[PDB]
Amino acid sequence: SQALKNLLTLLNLEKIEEGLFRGQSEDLGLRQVFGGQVVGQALYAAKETVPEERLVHSFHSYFLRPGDSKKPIIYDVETLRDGNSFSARRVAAIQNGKPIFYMTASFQAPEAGFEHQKTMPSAPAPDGLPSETQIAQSLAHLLPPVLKDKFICDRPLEVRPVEFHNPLKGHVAEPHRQVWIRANGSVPDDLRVHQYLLGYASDLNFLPVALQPHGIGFLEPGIQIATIDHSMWFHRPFNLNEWLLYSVESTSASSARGFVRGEFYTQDGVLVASTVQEGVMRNHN
Amino acid sequence: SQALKNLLTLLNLEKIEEGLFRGQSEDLGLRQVFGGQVVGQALYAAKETVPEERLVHSFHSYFLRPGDSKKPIIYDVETLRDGNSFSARRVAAIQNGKPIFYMTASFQAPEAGFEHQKTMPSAPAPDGLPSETQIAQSLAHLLPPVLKDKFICDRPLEVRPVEFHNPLKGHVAEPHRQVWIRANGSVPDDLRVHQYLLGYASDLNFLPVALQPHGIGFLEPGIQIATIDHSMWFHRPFNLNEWLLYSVESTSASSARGFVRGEFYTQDGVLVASTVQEGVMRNHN
Ligand SMILES: CCCCCCCCCCCC[N+](C)(C)[O-]
Ligand SMILES: CCCCCCCCCCCC[N+](C)(C)[O-]
């Protein structure tokens, strides 16, 4: 459970000045910075500069350089606009004197209006599915004692895939994936926190779906995937303490790029948010 | 023919300086600037500052204020990055000393890579379908020609809807729409041009689809819709001199906002581009 509090602490940026923050990275595997961390932290920085009643409803972002998790990241927020209804902000993520990421987010106050939504796709309940932590721990029995011990996944989130796609091997399959996600611990009763946490989560089990028709795992040798842009629209309020289905599809792949679109639904079938991302996808020999 | 020539001319911006242009606004219908005009002009501006071999593959944009078509628009391009593969640019559309819109676009040179795509949805051929212009002429067989002798056919694009949704009245219908589109004249043999023309076109028959479940047309009195953000990914090359199916869906509407996702297909079924947009949707009484 320490993992979730460690993530929430990590997303709660250190203020250097108005609209100027500093964030730590890492710690959980792989040296490059996880895209979700940048998204989550950029969202925090952005919301800190917006009227409290205005919640993020959308954001667009482009990744320009790989982030180094050994170094902190500086987030500089620019106020683009504050109208009778919307507040827009642009966040620059900086490391080594260069922008590594830009996000533009829009915020709006709560309001009733036209309501309609796509019907949730059918998917088996999370109850009968193993978590990625279970799957990893089972695969770890393949490692020798020296390595088996040190490893282990204490995660801030719990993920139960409908179909498991091993990133180390990969098998041919339709460009669709469904995973169930929820916080592995208690998330504060503040919707804003749930939002940037979902922002964080939205970058998991996403881009890799574009590799399925080609049976390649994203961690295999010679395979390189990297996010170019990540966008999200928060349609309705939600509680990440409860399950959410992340329904993902890859409608296209071409010119060394992979494209994916996702949707988050509550177990009861409420459409909570939508996501879109394109990233580099190369097979180097 | 003239209408297409006029639009292409209007999209061909006047250069004030490097990465600094000036664009005129359409006379063609509606005092407020058509979003498509801004998108098309911003793309032109961006592409002018990019290496010739690198074609736009995606862009994100936000509209901050309504544009006045009675005035020109200044487009200021900022170079965000020029890497071994990708070039990124941010375009600011200014009018009245204020930004009315921002777009960030990414460009990449052609390359061979993983290929796969969603299967084109079923749709009738454009052959037996009347154009919107034809439909307008048909429904207009009434009232004094005094006004009927001014509003007519000449559009830069020909649009043939699979199902007609009258913006003036509107009827309840599932949140899906299909319209066939092609240039009404000859587009020069430059993919870049076809691309920003498609950008222009991508803002048509889009957002209104979110109003369908509610049986309201966007030209009805007291009904207000306005684009907040428009994004697009150019998956493959295409020829706007030929027919393209614009398949649109509205997966959600809430909090006075409407969300739509679109896809362009060649008649032969090739997925050419994807779009996503959210906009304000209000009924003022
Ligand atoms: C051996 C530990 C098991 C964890 C494997 C970690 C893989 C890194 C996954 C995050 C990569 C996300 N993405 C789309 C940007 O590639
Ligand atoms: C008889 C009136 C038919 C409408 C003529 C106006 C065409 C311009 C349409 C652009 C409107 C775009 N949108 C979604 C922002 O409303």
From Swiss-Prot, chains A, B:
| Top enzyme class | hydrolase
Q: Which residues form the active site?
A: D203, T227, Q277
Q: Which GO terms describe its biological process?
A: acyl-CoA metabolic process; fatty acid catabolic process
| SUPFAM superfamilies (alphabetical) | Thioesterase/thiol ester dehydrase-isomerase
Q: Which UniProt keywords apply?
A: Hydrolase, Lipid metabolism
EC number(s) stated in the UniProt entry for this protein: 3.1.2.20
Q: Extract the GO molecular function terms from the UniProt entry.
A: fatty acyl-CoA hydrolase activity
Transmembrane annotation, as ranges? none
Provide the reaction this enzyme catalyses: a fatty acyl-CoA + H2O = a fatty acid + CoA + H(+); tetradecanoyl-CoA + H2O = tetradecanoate + CoA + H(+); (3E,5Z)-tetradecadienoyl-CoA + H2O = (3E,5Z)-tetradecadienoate + CoA + H(+); dodecanoyl-CoA + H2O = dodecanoate + CoA + H(+)
Cross-referenced InterPro entries: Acyl-CoA_hotdog, Acyl_CoA_thio, HotDog_dom_sf, TesB_ACOT8-like_N, TesB_C
User: Which Pfam family, any one of them, does this sequence belong to?
Assistant: Acyl_CoA_thio
Spell out the GO cellular component terms annotated for this protein, sorted alphabetically and separated by semicolons.
cytosol
What this chain does, per the record? Thioesterase that has relatively broad substrate specificity, hydrolyzing primarily medium- and long-chain acyl-CoA substrates to free fatty acids and CoA. Functions in the thioesterase-dependent pathway of beta-oxidation of oleate and conjugated linoleate ((9Z,11E)-octadecadienoate or CLA), which provides all energy and carbon precursors required for the growth of E.coli.
- Quaternary structure and interacting proteins, as annotated: Homotetramer.
Which family is annotated? Belongs to the C/M/P thioester hydrolase family.
Fetch the NCBIfam families from UniProt.
PRK10526.1, tesB
The molecule here is called Acyl-CoA thioesterase 2
Q: Which organism is it from?
A: Escherichia coli O157:H7
